[model samples]
Target chain A: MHQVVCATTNPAKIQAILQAFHEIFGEGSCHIASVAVESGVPEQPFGSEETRAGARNRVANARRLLPEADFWVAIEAGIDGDSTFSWVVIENASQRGEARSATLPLPAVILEKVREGEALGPVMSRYEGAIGVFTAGKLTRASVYHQAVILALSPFHNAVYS
Target chain B: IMHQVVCATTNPAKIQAILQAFHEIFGEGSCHIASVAVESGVPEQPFGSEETRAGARNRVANARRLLPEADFWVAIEAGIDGDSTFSWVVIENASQRGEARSATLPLPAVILEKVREGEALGPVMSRYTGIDEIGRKEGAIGVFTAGKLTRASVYHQAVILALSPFHNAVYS
Candidate 1:
């Protein structure tokens, strides 16, 4: 089994990583460990640059902490204007990859809350007091990140990515 | 039985890309595609996601109007957003629809400015590269990415993603 260390304790993100690795590398091919690592960005990353930087930072830190693992992974969710999306970063000994998930457009009111220094998760939680609202029908936050993870892992599996 | 698809463009590159995408999803020899030229109903150079998506949807609608017997109608529309360029793909049938946007890539600064000033990308890129019908060939994407990715390949990926709803049970 391949050893993978992920830089997030969030259950959904861990699930996303596990699902992506399993899909890409075949089921039961990887064992993933989750660690709580600092993103080195603000609590709420606002734009693409910060979001991507957050993910990259987490992967670097995870790699530093677990140098023996076959892969280090990180996912950072962020907002740009009224849209929310995630960035996924994957790194191995020889190759590194990054990808952004498809966007989910937030309502204007939700964006207003984000602009006022409220974290999107809390704002969304308090707004509807619900979990499934931020995602498309039958598409969870984890699944969206899962797709991005698969995209980010392309360099490892596809010759075209080299 | 084979699926009949009508792609809303006479552009041979896009037609080939759509066919390749269909084969990738449905397996080879599973479908046949026809190409028809249709208006996108938006500015020649759509500037943002909203406009690009509108253009793609309009093309699909126009194609369906002209070829009502096809099993699927597809369209692809490319657009620029600030320094980035991307494309939107739309595919639909009687009971289902799938839409996907391609990953954005950075454009040359000069091309971005010219397109912003009302010049369409195809003409601007052709004029800059001195390659006639460059958009019909490898395209600005090919020029920038150094053929690592052609316009056809980029659209091919988006078309595959646009088929997600059709294949994934959750979307049903």
Candidate 2:
């Protein structure tokens, strides 16, 4: 079994991580712990670099808080120009892996709000739009994040990382 | 009605992805797939959305031209934008078209630097890990993720998304 600590308590992120770990390591292979921590980036990161940095910082903070865990993970979402996406980071004692979620194009109206310094999470909460329709309700935000987590866990599962 | 599908590549991984998506969307045994080798008409490692989408589109067009009698033609092209990697899928029938992209996964700086220098990901990864055609087998995504997710799985999700417009009434 693996002792894993995730650096967020948000239900969506928590759920994604749990499902991802189960899929990658089998259902009973991981014991997961969730803790709230600072990402060390803005509430609304602007680009891939800043967004990825937020996830990395969260993983570092989680590791600092719990040194004995076998793995540390974090997720951060951000906007790059007219698109919104997420980054996931995972690490163990010896190796690190990261993956970026697929991007969704923000409608021009939404982009205007984001450009005006509005946080995307809050903006999206107030807006109900066409993404579900576009994907035929098949790919949800949580599922996309879940896929990123699975990809980020790749290094831990293979020998190439060593 | 049963549908005849042509996938524009002979790669087992890519073909399996198309098969799985068709089974899930159109129901098992409702579709038959034929994999054919076709050129994407792009460089080995396409960078950015435009180039990647073109590769997939070109494959679809090429497949259709090569096998005009199929009910549907499909293609998938993996690409990168800066340090992040993703793929595009194009699926089309006689009258309707669909396209979707996979999640963009970030590559380690160690890998991206070489790719940026004009090395194709397949060859680069093969040399980096001493594995032959890693992209054809478990894939670079597989190697980095520890086999947790293979290239086919990534493409599988995109294929489903590409099929959305066909099944979803909104697009019609």
Candidate 3:
């Protein structure tokens, strides 16, 4: 079975990665594993550069930790001013790639909470906020992040398994 | 009956997309794509669209020589023009031979400037992005378009364009 090393032990992100792999390569094509390594940066990355840096580093670390795996994946997400964005990076023996996730503007209240040194996740939880509120959809912060995780795995969409 | 198409390069990047292009043109399961690495007899790095295209044509010619029984032979080469970078595709079979140049989008100015300085776009683009062999993966198209358009998808469109004669009653 193909093996994957993920930089997160977050259940949502892990599930998202597994689901994406299944969606692309079909069921049973991949085996999932994770390492709870430190991000080695501030809990919240400031902009695209820091955010992308986290992702790039996470995947590089994952590969370094488990160099024998078939694939390594990392998801780095953060708030960017009034908007939020994430980057996903994947690497393997043959190739490596990075993709930016969809961006969404935060409601003013959430933006203030984020700017005042509160983490987006807990602040979002406290406010009982949803990312798709203005757009009228059932989008939780985790779900939004999960969708980006899926898109990050786009390179494997055309791959041949087995 | 599924047609067997021999691609001039063994790169799965080319073969997989070649299969996608064929399946797009004739519907699923209509073509079997294979790859054979052949010497194109071209420069290490062709400078412009014309020589790049000649490289593709030469690849197909060599593949045709190697696999005469194949229904079609295919080759693809990437090159630069102004600030834009693009690919060329050549397709040949028992009945006909045709080639087409794909669309070009402006590459990063860093890429164009470095390519003019005698550095290959593939290695330069990879180093610029801090990725390993970016061309073999999503490529410059993927870098510019995000993951929305990969190297394969862009090349797939070109192969489809080159296969247009098969769709035209007048042209065929």
Per-residue C-alpha lDDT of model 2 across residues B1-172, encoded as one tens digit per residue: 7999999988899999999988878889999989888899998889888899899999999999989999999998989976678888889998888877777666777778888888888888888889988877888777776667788888887787678657765345
* Deviation of model 3 at A160, angstroms: 34
Clashing pairs in 1: none
Better of 1 and 2 by DockQ: 2
| TM-score of chain A taken by itself, candidate 1 | 0.93
Compute each candidate's TM-score over C-alphas: 0.61, 0.74, 0.51
For all candidates in order, state the fraction of native interface contacts they contain. Answer: 0.02, 0.34, 0.00
Descending-lDDT candidate ranking: 2, 1, 3
Off by over 4 Å in 1: A1-162
- Distance from true location, Cα of A124 in model 1, Å: 20
What DockQ was computed for model 1? Answer: 0.08
Worst 10 residues of 2 chain B by lDDT: B163-172
* Clashes per candidate, residues 3 or more apart or on different chains: 0, 5, 0
CA shift of B151, model 3, Å: 0.7
Give the fraction of true interface contacts kept by model 1.
0.02
Error of 2 at A110 (Å): 10
Which structure among the candidates has the greatest DockQ?
Answer: 2
Q: Rate the local accuracy (lDDT) of all candidates.
A: 0.77, 0.82, 0.69
Better of 2 and 3 by TM-score: 2
The per-residue C-alpha lDDT of model 3 at residue B117 equals 90
